[PDB]
């Protein structure tokens, strides 16, 4: 299959003590512009980091100067970390992410309900996050009284947004919820006859 | 911070001593891809489908955790043993979908500003401990604190209220979050 490569945490030369490390890959236009940033944190305090826009370990606090200067001195470490923009970021994007995260398309579940007056158009269980939700009343875009929630991250690679409309059901009206999403060849129109 | 389309957060390592407690995870656009169970030495994928589509050799996580343990020793000495500051956590409870009688649902308890990464999150339905619960790995925040989410599959009935119990060192006594 395809394999996930991590960054190589370069090594340094009641109470509790916490150390953290993380490698952050920032992609724009696919791989047309990658930016790679590794961060070394001691007790919520970032003290060393490698920023590929800089090209060198910089200390963030006084605790980072030994380790930044050290990791700069030895080329086996430095040039390897620099390469991890291609051996970690570019690798993971062009490989395992393309076969997983960047292939995931979950179509949304659009459901109009009436709470009590206020119509609630719930859009649930979709991926990725780009999505547009517009109300219509008898076929005219309503942008007044329309309040949507923020994008809610469920925690299982599916999002969910709720768009409430304020209205008053006159017999014969036709409200529609118009939902566009990249997992949808055509948009979704869910109607609600008054 | 930096602006981009996609953000892979690759190789998130945490180590904390005393106690020999670690965590090695991968994220993409905010969601966890997998973590490496350090005791079972195994890659637990968030989505099993992904685990069937790609792969990660958990030994890489194991070595990286070894390195981080080393760096933790050195930096522990170098700072004259400056210990860690405890952080008051903040819990909020809410349901996955809007509440509705007898409709199977998930009661989410989101706890933020966790540091150090040791929390005990207990569910208390009818003021009695409950557990089908699921809790997640620690997600790293921009301020290098942590947030952890505990869900709870439940059927809502009007009879029983709900509170999230949070146990942490930044808390003199535990803290309860009603619903």
């Amino acid at each position: 299959r395809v394999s996930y490569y991590g960054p190589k945490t370069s090594p340094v030369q009641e109470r509790h003590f916490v150390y953290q490390f993380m490698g952050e890959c920032y992609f724009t236009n696919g791989t047309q512009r990658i930016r790679y940033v590794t961060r070394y944190i001691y007790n919520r305090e970032e003290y060393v980091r490698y920023d590929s826009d800089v090209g060198e370990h910089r200390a963030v606090t006084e605790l980072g100067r030994p380790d930044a200067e050290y990791w700069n001195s030895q080329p086996e470490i430095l040039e390897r970390t620099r390469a991890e923009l291609d051996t970690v970021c570019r690798h993971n994007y062009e490989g395992p992410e393309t076969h997983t995260s960047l292939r995931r398309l979950e179509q949304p579940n659009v459901v109009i309900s009436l709470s009590r007056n206020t119509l609630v158009c719930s859009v649930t269980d979709f991926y990725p996050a780009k999505i547009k939700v517009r109300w219509f009343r008898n076929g005219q875009e309503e942008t007044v009284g329309v309040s949507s929630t923020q994008l809610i991250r469920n925690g299982d690679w599916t999002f969910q947004v709720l768009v409430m409309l304020e209205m008053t059901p006159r017999r014969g009206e036709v409200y529609t919820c118009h939902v566009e999403h990249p997992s949808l060849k055509s948009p979704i129109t869910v109607e609600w006859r008054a | 911070a930096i602006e981009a389309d996609h953000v892979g957060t690759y190789g998130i390592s945490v180590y904390q001593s005393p106690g020999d407690i670690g965590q090695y995870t991968f994220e993409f656009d905010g969601d966890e891809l997998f973590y490496v169970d350090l005791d079972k030495k195994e890659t637990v994928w968030m989505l099993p489908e992904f685990g069937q589509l790609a792969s990660f050799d958990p030994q890489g996580g194991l070595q990286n955790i070894a390195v981080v343990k080393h760096n933790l020793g050195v930096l522990t000495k170098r700072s004259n043993s400056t210990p860690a500051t405890n952080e008051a956590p903040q819990a909020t409870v809410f349901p996955k979908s809007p509440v509705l009688l007898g409709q199977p649902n998930t009661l989410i308890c989101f706890v933020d500003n966790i540091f150090p990464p040791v929390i005990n999150i207990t569910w208390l339905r009818n003021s009695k401990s409950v557990a089908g619960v699921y809790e997640t790995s620690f997600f790293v925040n921009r301020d290098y604190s942590f947030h952890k989410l505990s869900y709870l599959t439940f059927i809502p009935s009007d009879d029983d209220i709900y509170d999230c119990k949070v146990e942490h060192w930044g808390l003199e006594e535990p803290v309860l979050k009603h619903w």
Partner: T-cell receptor
Amino acid sequence: QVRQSPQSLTVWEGETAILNCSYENSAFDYFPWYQQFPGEGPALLIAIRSVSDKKEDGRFTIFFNKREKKLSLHITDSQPGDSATYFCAASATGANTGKLTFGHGTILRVHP
Amino acid sequence: AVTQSPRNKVAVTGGKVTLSCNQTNNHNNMYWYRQDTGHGLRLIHYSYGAGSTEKGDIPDGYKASRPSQENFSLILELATPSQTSVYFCASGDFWGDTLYFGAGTRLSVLE
């Protein structure tokens, strides 16, 4: 796996020994050739990386073919002190494993 | 350097055989291989640092132990004649590209 041919080689003093290696997994990018003398542990002789096809170190030379996944260690003007076993290892370093998977080694005898 | 101990040993089937390895290179990765003709070098156990052990390709019959950064010990709790072989200890640095093998241990397990 890592497969080495031939299982043992015999060369005359002065000639060029050609020890061959081949790997299956294309994730491999680091290929260290270890050498072992009788009664001794093996020690890193000469190592190459997939980026460069050829590594030269005086008499020793690694030739690397990424396409055909094949390696060839050349020893030129071999002395009878080269009689020894040569293991060909490979590792996918990106996996951050620490495990090296060795070939079964070829046995070199150099006739004086 | 990396000195194993003992460098020769004879043990009856069913006895306990503790192969010790010491390493003075300030390395962290340590390995226990064995060598057999026709099977090359086969990794038995390895350890990333004090307190942890990892399972090699052939952990069956053997049990590692890393009480220190310097010391890495193979343990044969119930020796068998199939474990008669030449055992080799090694050590390397994190992400290292060189392995530093020991001298050797000829182990004879005999009925």
